[PDB]
């Protein structure tokens, strides 16, 4: 369902359903969400990169694990927020690599990676509205942060299929690869990111995303209890240490 | 006051005082308010259209009866702000045409539309600040999210005159057209998306308007609710149908 | 420390340890705010212009003491973050003019300006991550606000050095000068707004500070109740005379 793999402090994770383009079942998020609490817990993991096999990286929820089943949406949805809520809480850094179509909610988890990279010929389609659905697994909450409240609009408004230059131009991915080359660029990105010091990262994610509903003096707070603890780490001492002798830190993630 | 108009679902709404560039009064706003309620209450219409008549959109706050006694600008608004309130809450798309001048409260009421298109030569100034006032009508709620903290800032304090090319830029509008194809342009877009899941849209605008402040969890809370809603709706069921049948859907509204 | 000086309703406050790039220390950090107090509570200061002696706008957090005992970043920003509290609070224009490097807290400071410009040859560095600490003095605040959720991930994960150019592209500066002539704009700027209507702009950054964690309602009530406020100075009687009688008005911040 999910192929695990590890290279230099590196978890790549890859949606692998390549024949129904990556589309999402319950089945699928169980073994995301177990992957995900594995990389979090393992300390050799400094990093994750996620990915889809095949031509698309997920084109969202398989409509064949319905059948004609009446709609549960409310509850149906409870896998895929016990994912999101993994991806937004992890304490080391996502790197995704959109590989080729992301649409539904294969797009709302593409977008909760800290560093996003498309390949050519990649696109982004919100795809809900066409078939009469909200924006879910966190989408309404990261598009309008990540592109805009202007841009989020028509986004899910109107569900134009985005192409890869598109996503960068508006944020949706910080980079455009050629295909044979998405791989390569990501793992390298997220190898450099394992090298990071990973405190650091996962206190910065956090304070990031509950930046915009606290009042000024309330962020102010949560940065300093934050770097209290950022400060306390053996990463930040080599990181002055590092500085002073004029050399590369080398940081362990503690 | 303000002209109404009714094709294939679109509720066609003109701010009709041309003579005085569609100044904003009391009485405009009443029968906005009016416009307005009669459109969220008519379930025949699933879209409207907002526009100005004459040579501007709408130049802002009438100026005429100031001095007449002591200024109330907080009673004033805590009357009127039910009409921002209703904007806001429409159950169905809004489409606004920015035909001329859009400045003040007449900025702040173009800003509210879902999709917004501007007709070339048509302008945008906060203007507010130049006759010592803050932005109101809901600008400082819409400004910073719809072009970001950095341009609100630069917009709203130093007032310039924006081109419809560079409102464009800053996504105060989705599109930029020739002035004597503006309502064309617009009406067609507005009839598109009358013919779209009214319900979808409604509750997508629902969630866009809670997205800062609420937490990540909260968020997914309501949009699983909110999914949940969607998804009893006639127009998911004929989505579904219309996808598995590879057919166009024929959406209702419901 | 910190050189003050007045000049046409314009208090100019100037980071003064040039041989440490304006590095920042709590005795740096006590001159500021008091300075900023004194700017704040004098009547006649209608504008505030921040700037760096030297090569450097502020390379950040002097690491001089570090080592000397346990870091204790918490208790050090619980103690400092009044002067963060004093920026955002100043209820008047503050234009900051960034004359070369702005890293790390020198950053956070920057961009607290209302109106910020960089010379040719200024530079960006969110810097905090390089030794393993999380962005702080605002910075997790302001950032995803001013640039946007995608742009701020990347400036704070990757810290990468910003040439004003690209900061003036973000929004993380309004304008670019020659070197030689930064002062001489930033200064102009200054003055021009130490003539506009105070408190029209110290009601309106109060509205932008508080903006995205408030609901639509509770956003429109405080528009009320600012408008009502500003309706009552003097300056908004002087701006619709102004305006009426075709001629600029002549505001005194009252």
């Known amino acids: 369902m999910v192929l695990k793999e590890r290279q230099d402090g590196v978890l790549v994770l890859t949606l692998n359903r390549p024949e129904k383009l990556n589309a999402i079942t319950g089945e699928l998020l169980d073994a995301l969400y ?3 609490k594995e990389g979090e817990e393992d300390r050799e993991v400094r990093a994750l990169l996620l990915t889809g096999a095949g031509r698309a990286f997920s084109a969202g929820q398989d409509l064949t694990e319905f059948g004609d089943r009446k ?3 409310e509850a149906h949805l409870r896998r895929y927020n016990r994912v999101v809520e993994a991806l937004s809480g992890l304490e080391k850094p996502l790197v995704v ?3 080729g179509v992301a649409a539904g909610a294969g797009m709302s988890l593409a977008l909760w990676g800290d560093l996003r990279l498309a390949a050519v010929g ?3 389609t919100t795809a809900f509205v066409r078939i009469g659905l909200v924006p879910d697994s966190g989408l309404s909450f990261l ?3 990540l592109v805009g409240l202007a841009k989020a609009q028509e986004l899910l408004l109107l569900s134009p299929r985005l192409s890869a230059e598109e996503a960068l131009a508006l944020g949706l991915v910080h980079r455009v690869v050629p295909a044979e080359k998405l791989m390569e660029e990501a793992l390298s990105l997220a190898k450099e990111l394992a090298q990071g010091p990973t405190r650091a990262y996962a206190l910065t994610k956090k304070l990031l995303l509950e930046t915009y509903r606290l009042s000024l003096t309330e962020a102010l707070a949560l940065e ?3 770097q209290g603890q950022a400060g306390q780490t053996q990463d930040h001492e ?3 240490r590092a500085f ?3 050399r590369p830190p080398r940081f362990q993630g503690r």
Do not use: C
């Open 34 to 36: 177990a992957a995900l």
């Open 71 to 73: 709609p549960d949406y």
């Open 97 to 99: 690599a959109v590989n």
């Open 122 to 124: 990649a696109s982004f």
């Open 143 to 145: 598009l309008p942060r």
């Open 224 to 226: 300093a209890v934050l």
């Open 238 to 240: 080599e990181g002055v």
């Open 244 to 246: 002073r002798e004029k």
